[PDB]
Design a protein around this ligand. Structure first.
Ligand SMILES: Nc1nc2c(ncn2[C@H]2C[C@H](O)[C@@H](COP(=O)(O)OP(=O)(O)OP(=O)(O)O)O2)c(=O)[nH]1
Ligand SMILES: [Ca+2]
Ligand SMILES: [Ca+2]
Ligand SMILES: [Ca+2]
Ligand SMILES: [Ca+2]
Ligand SMILES: [Cl-]
Ligand SMILES: [Zn+2]
Length: 575
C-alpha cells in the first residue's frame, strides 16, 4: 500500500505551503487529505481504479487532490511536492517538523535566524537565543530542545536489551487499558534483533479508536506524533518512540504476523497466500471476501499451509523453505538453559558475593552458575594473582560443599596477551572448572596478527570457551578484525566453544557470527557477563540470538546438566 507514503507527501506539502504562507484553507485541506490517507485501510490504488469521482468520495479529497493522487500513482511523485521542495531546503523543513515546532515559527526561524537545518537550532537553544527571537518564549524553550532530541533519535538504533524491559512495562499498561483484549510487542524486538528502531505494539480491540485514545493518554506518554482511528505514534516520557496498531479481536493473529515482519518474511507469506487463491492482510486470511483465518497466529500460518514459524526466524533466510518442507529447525528455548556460563563476583569486578550469586541462580531455577572472574590484565589491576586464583578455587569448592545446587563452577575470564599467551599459567588453568579466554587489549592489530593471536590462544589445551569473541561494545567499540573462519575452525578442532554473551551492549557473538559458528559444527556457550544480579535477565537475549542463528539445544553447553557439563569440560575434546 502507498497510503502512508501519500499521506506523508500531502502533509509535507501542507507544512511547506504554510511555511511559504499559502491560503490557510489550502494548508488545512492538505492536512485533512493526509489524515484521510493515514486512516484509510483499503489500498488507495483500489479507489483510484474506480475513477476521479470515487476518489472525491473520500473525506477531504476534492478535484485538485484527486488529480494529485492519480499523478502519484502513475508517476511515483507529485510535482507540487517537488516544486515546494525547490523553495524549501531539507533541514528548513526538518526544523519546522522537529516535534513542537512548525512552519510559521520555522519561517521566522528561517528568515530571522538563518535556519534550514538543525545544528543552528541546537546552538540557539543552548545560548538562549530563542529567548529573544520574536515568538519564542518560556515553556516552549523546553519543548523545542526535547523535540530535537526525539528527531535525532528516530534515525538511530538502540540495543534490544537497553529497551526491552521498558517496552514490557509499556506493554503492561497497554494490556490494562479497558477495551484492550490482547496486546503484544511486535516489530524487530519480537524477532530478537540485537538493535531496534522504533517499538511497535499490536492491540486487539472491538473499539479501536477508543483504545487509541486511552493509549495516547497513558501516564507514560509525553508527545503524540500521529494518531488516527486505528493507529498512533507517540514518544514516551522515557524517550521511547512507539507505534501502535489496533485490529479487531478476530484479526489479532493476522495483525501479529503483519506487525512482526520482517517485511521480507511477510512478502513471502503474501505470495504463498495468493498462489493458493487466498489473500493475507493485516486483518486475516481471505478466500475472496470470506475471512478464513485471523484470530491466532498459528491459524494464519495453517491457512497458508505452514507450521507456525518462530519470530526470530522471520528474516527470509531459509525459514519459508524449511516450513514448506515441514522441517523447521529445532531451536534452543529458555527453559532448556540450565545455567549461566559467565558471571562475575566481588573476587574481581562484580558487585555480588558468592552467596548472592547462588541465591539469584537458585531463584531462577538454574542447576549451576559459572563464576568467571578476570585474570589480572583484564582490569589493568595487580590481581587476582595466580596464587590467589587458586585460593579462590578452594573457596568456591568449599562454598559448594556447604551449599549444594545450584553449583558454582570455579572459572576465570583469562586475558589473551598480545602475543597469544594467556594471563594465567597452566597450573592455574588446569585447576579451574571453566576457562574462558578473551581479548581486552590491542583491539586494532592488523587482521592477520589478531587472527594469529586468537589461534595461539586456542593452542592451549586447558581452554574451554572463547568469550565475547569480537569484543564489540554497541555504540562504543567496533568488533575486532579477525578471520573468523580460521578462528572457529581451530576452536572446533580443539573442542573450544564460542560464547554468545547476551549482556545488552555486547551481544557477542552477534547472531550472524553465531549462525556461522553453529553451522561450522562448533559448541556454543551462553552467558550474561553479569556484574550484578539484575544482569542475569539478559539470558533471554542470548537465547533469542541463538534462535535467530538457527541454534538448537544440541551443542549448547548450557543445556547439559551439571554432571554432563563437568564431563564435557574434563574430556578429551576436539579431533
Ligand atoms: N520494513 C517494513 N516493514 C513493514 C512495511 N509495512 C509493514 N511492515 C511491517 C513489517 C515490520 O517488521 C513491521 C514494523 O515496521 P518497522 O518499520 O518498525 O520495522 P521493524 O520493527 O521490523 O525494524 P526496526 O528495528 O524498527 O528498523 O511492520 C514496510 O513498508 N517496510
Ligand atoms: Ca470529498
Ligand atoms: Ca484490558
Ligand atoms: Ca520497529
Ligand atoms: Ca514502526
Ligand atoms: Cl495468537
Ligand atoms: Zn571480558
Amino acid at each position: 500500500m502507498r497510503n502512508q507514503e501519500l499521506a506523508r507527501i500531502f502533509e509535507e506539502i501542507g507544512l511547506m505551503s504554510e511555511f511559504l504562507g499559502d491560503n490557510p484553507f489550502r494548508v488545512r485541506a492538505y492536512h485533512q487529505a493526509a489524515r484521510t490517507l493515514y486512516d484509510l485501510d483499503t489500498p488507495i490504488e483500489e479507489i483510484a481504479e474506480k475513477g476521479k469521482e470515487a476518489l472525491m468520495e473520500l473525506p477531504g479529497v476534492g478535484p485538485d487532490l484527486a488529480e494529485k493522487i492519480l499523478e502519484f500513482l502513475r508517476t511515483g511523485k507529485v510535482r507540487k511536492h517537488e516544486e515546494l521542495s525547490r523553495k524549501v531546503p531539507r533541514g528548513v523543513l526538518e526544523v519546522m517538523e522537529v516535534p513542537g515546532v512548525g512552519p510559521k515559527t520555522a519561517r521566522l526561524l528561517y528568515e530571522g535566524l538563518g535556519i534550514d537545518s538543525l545544528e543552528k537550532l541546537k546552538a540557539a537553544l543552548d545560548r538562549g537565543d530563542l529567548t529573544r527571537l520574536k515568538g519564542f518564549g518560556p515553556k516552549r524553550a523546553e519543548r523545542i530542545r526535547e523535540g530535537l532530541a526525539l528527531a535525532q533519535a528516530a534515525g538511530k538504533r538502540r540495543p534490544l536489551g537497553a529497551v526491552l524491559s521498558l517496552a514490557r512495562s509499556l506493554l503492561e499498561a497497554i494490556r490494562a487499558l479497558p477495551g484492550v483484549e490482547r496486546a503484544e510487542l511486535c516489530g524487530s524486538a519480537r524477532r530478537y534483533k540485537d538493535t531496534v528502531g522504533d517499538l511497535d505494539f499490536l492491540v486487539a480491540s472491538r473499539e479501536g479508536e477508543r483504545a487509541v485514545e486511552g493509549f495516547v493518554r497513558l501516564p507514560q506518554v509525553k508527545e503524540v506524533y500521529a494518531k488516527g482511528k486505528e493507529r498512533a505514534t507517540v514518544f514516551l516520557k522515557n524517550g521511547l518512540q512507539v507505534d501502535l496498531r489496533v485490529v479487531p479481536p478476530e484479526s489479532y493473529g493476522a495483525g501479529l504476523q503483519y506487525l512482526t515482519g520482517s517485511d521480507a518474511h511477510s512478502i513471502r507469506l503474501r505470495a504463498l497466500a495468493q498462489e493458493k487463491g487466498l489473500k493475507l492482510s493485516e486483518y486475516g486470511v481471505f478466500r475472496g471476501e470470506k475471512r478464513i483465518a485471523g484470530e491466532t497466529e498459528e491459524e494464519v500460518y495453517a491457512a497458508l499451509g505452514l507450521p507456525w514459524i518462530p519470530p526470530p526466524l522471520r528474516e527470509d533466510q531459509g525459514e519459508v523453505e524449511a516450513a514448506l518442507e515441514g522441517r523447521l529447525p529445532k531451536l534452543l528455548e529458555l527453559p532448556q538453559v540450565k545455567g549461566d556460563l559467565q558471571v562475575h563476583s566481588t573476587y574481581s569486578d562484580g558487585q555480588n558475593t558468592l552467596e548472592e550469586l547462588w541465591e539469584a541462580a537458585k531463584t531462577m531455577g538454574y542447576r549451576y552458575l559459572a563464576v568467571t572472574d578476570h585474570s589480572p590484565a583484564v582490569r589493568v589491576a595487580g590481581g587476582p594473582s595466580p596464587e590467589e586464583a587458586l585460593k579462590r578455587v578452594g573457596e568456591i569448592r568449599r562454598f559448594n560443599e556447604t551449599h549444594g545446587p545450584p553449583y558454582l563452577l570455579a572459572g576465570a575470564e583469562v586475558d589473551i596477551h598480545p602475543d597469544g599467551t594467556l594471563d594465567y599459567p597452566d597450573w592455574v588453568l588446569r585447576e579451574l572448572d571453566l576457562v574462558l579466554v578473551s581479548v581486552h587489549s590491542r583491539f586494532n592489530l592488523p587482521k592477520a596478527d589478531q587472527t594469529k593471536r586468537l589461534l595461539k590462544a586456542l593452542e592451549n589445551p586447558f581452554v574451554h570457551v572463547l568469550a565475547h569473541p569480537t569484543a564489540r561494545l554497541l555504540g562504543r567499540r567496533a568488533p575486532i578484525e579477525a578471520d573468523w573462519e580460521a578462528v572457529f575452525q581451530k576452536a572446533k578442532e580443539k573442542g573450544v566453544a564460542v560464547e554468545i554473551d547476551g549482556y545488552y551492549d555486547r551481544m557477542d557473538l552477534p547472531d550472524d557470527l553465531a549462525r556461522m559458528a553453529y553451522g561450522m559444527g562448533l559448541w556454543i556457550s551462553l552467558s550474561t557477563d553479569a556484574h550484578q544480579t539484575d544482569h542475569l535477565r539478559f539470558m533471554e537475549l542470548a537465547v533469542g540470538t541463538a534462535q535467530r542463528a538457527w541454534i538448537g539445544p544440541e551443542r549448547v553447553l548450557n543445556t547439559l546438566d551439571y554432571e554432563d557439563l563437568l564431563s564435557w569440560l574434563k574430556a578429551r575434546r576436539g579431533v
